[PDB]
Write a structure and sequence with these properties.
The structure is a homodimer. By secondary structure, chain A is an all-alpha fold. In chain A, helix 2 runs parallel beside helix 9 and helix 6 crosses helix 10. The relative contact order of chain A is 0.16. The interface between A and B is small, with 9 and 12 residues. Bound molecules: ligand TSA (2 copies) and tryptophan (2 copies). Chains A, B: This is Chorismate mutase. Chains A, B: It catalyses: chorismate = prephenate. Chains A, B: One of its GO terms (molecular function) is L-tyrosine binding.
Chain lengths: 252, 252
């Protein structure tokens, strides 16, 4: 799977292989975040103890958005597989453009669930993966930066749906063209769901969590929780992006 | 703790013991609700697909209010520990009155947070305890009825604050009389907060959630979430009722 070989990019298998390598990345990232308390204050927008000059949002917010700006400048978002958590704040690259062939539809950047991911991450995931409950009054930076690692991997993974979505469309235009004109969610949802795969995925996760989540010489990550996270969130939103991308596919 | 032994009712310990038995009730209720999707449509007031003849409100609304009426008739609300979610719609009992001695101040019925509880329950709790996200197009009744079980236990528990509040007042009139005339929230808040207890509570919850939330032969309820719910909502609003009841205590 290379971005300058549209064929390898739109291959459904190659895509799944890539999602797989990501499983480990996410696990690792979770494991790292697991070393710190939940740190409520990091996520509170405009916390009194952490007022950020000219900024409405959370500590995490500041850190993340800033990083997105810096990165935007060095071509981060002109890569189709990277969708910004703060699209309203990203500048243009001061580096000559990498001219990636179009592999997706022109509106792809507009398909963007980060808003959700971030909320669910903070509300549902954190409680599952952190040591204690409470503020680690002098690790907010440590926590935030890690949070961002998680968030950027989740977003990459999830937004990969677009590639899958496109891949599936391509492979039976009529079936999908029919479904899309109809705005037949349930029908589309039915066709993209492939439970067999979803299941085998949760199986790997459980093993990985077992072997990675424990010092081989315990439980920095709970296998059940890792499954829960994926099963309830990761995989549901990935599909949720496929339908979305699909509805607008015939668009224009 | 018997309602016809004012002394056992106003005992701070007996009261805490009763709040404890409730922990399990709530857990059980959560666990039951956990079997179904979030079912957005149940909570939407006047949903097009579920228009209820002569009724402005949600499906849940209809079901709950109706039940409150029926119950009111058979003496439900003349019991001090039961505070109505729909006080504006409850009738009088067609059964001879149980004549409970006054154990609380006369305005107690007026101290009523259901409005909040219901909103927070729907917005914050549901997302934490349900299987999937989405409408289970043919379980709205199943979901609603369960929702009501949760709501009625939460409300009972939370409004128990009044009893605690009264209990504490009684045990140092001057301190509180002083505080109340002053409208000294923070002072009152400080005196009723007893972190030690709050903490031991969250400890039990975590264990219970572990043992109850899993088939002993998993995770119908997440221990962390159960704590979150209590820590963030249950316990905060219970206090919020104690101050409220307290401010109006000297009233008249
Ligand atoms: O075809 C696929 O492989 C993709 C990925 C997906 C996931 O989230 O892992 C797995 C199974 C499918 O039901 C969906 C979602 O599309
Ligand atoms: O004295 C008490 O026992 C009550 C109950 C309470 C709770 O919500 O559990 C626990 C501790 C106190 O800080 C408050 C709230 O008053
Ligand atoms: N992988 C692409 C885009 C990219 C991904 N992550 C980044 C972070 C910073 C800058 C660019 C990127 C590239 O570097 O060409
Ligand atoms: N426990 C009281 C009041 C009560 C509680 N829940 C009820 C439901 C319906 C009718 C009455 C009640 C009684 O039954 O005497």
């Amino acid at each position: 799977m290379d971005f300058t070989k549209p064929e390898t990019v739109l291959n459904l298998q190659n895509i799944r292989d890539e999602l797989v390598r990501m499983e480990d990345s996410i696990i690792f990232k979770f494991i790292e975040r697991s070393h710190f308390a939940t740190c409520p204050s990091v996520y509170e927008a405009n916390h009194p103890g952490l007022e950020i000059p000219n900024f409405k949002g959370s500590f995490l917010d500041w850190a993340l958005s800033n990083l997105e700006i810096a990165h935007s400048r060095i071509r981060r978002f002109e890569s189709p597989d990277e969708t910004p958590f703060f699209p309203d704040k990203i500048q243009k690259s001061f580096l000559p453009s990498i001219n990636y062939p179009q592999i997706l539809a022109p509106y792809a950047p507009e398909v963007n669930y980060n808003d959700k991911i971030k909320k669910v991450y903070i509300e549902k995931i954190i409680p599952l993966i952190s040591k204690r409950d409470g503020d680690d009054k002098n690790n907010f930076g440590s926590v935030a930066t890690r949070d961002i690692e998680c968030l950027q991997s989740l977003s990459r993974r999830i937004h990969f749906g677009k590639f899958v979505a496109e891949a599936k469309f391509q492979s039976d235009i009529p079936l999908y063209t029919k479904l899309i004109k109809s705005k037949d969610v349930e029908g589309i949802m039915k066709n993209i769901t492939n439970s067999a795969v979803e299941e085998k995925i949760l199986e790997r996760l459980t093993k990985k969590a077992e072997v990675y989540g424990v010092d081989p010489t315990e439980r920095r990550i709970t296998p059940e929780y890792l499954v829960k996270i994926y099963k309830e969130i990761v995989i549901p939103i990935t599909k949720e992006v496929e339908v979305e991308y699909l509805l607008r596919r015939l668009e224009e």
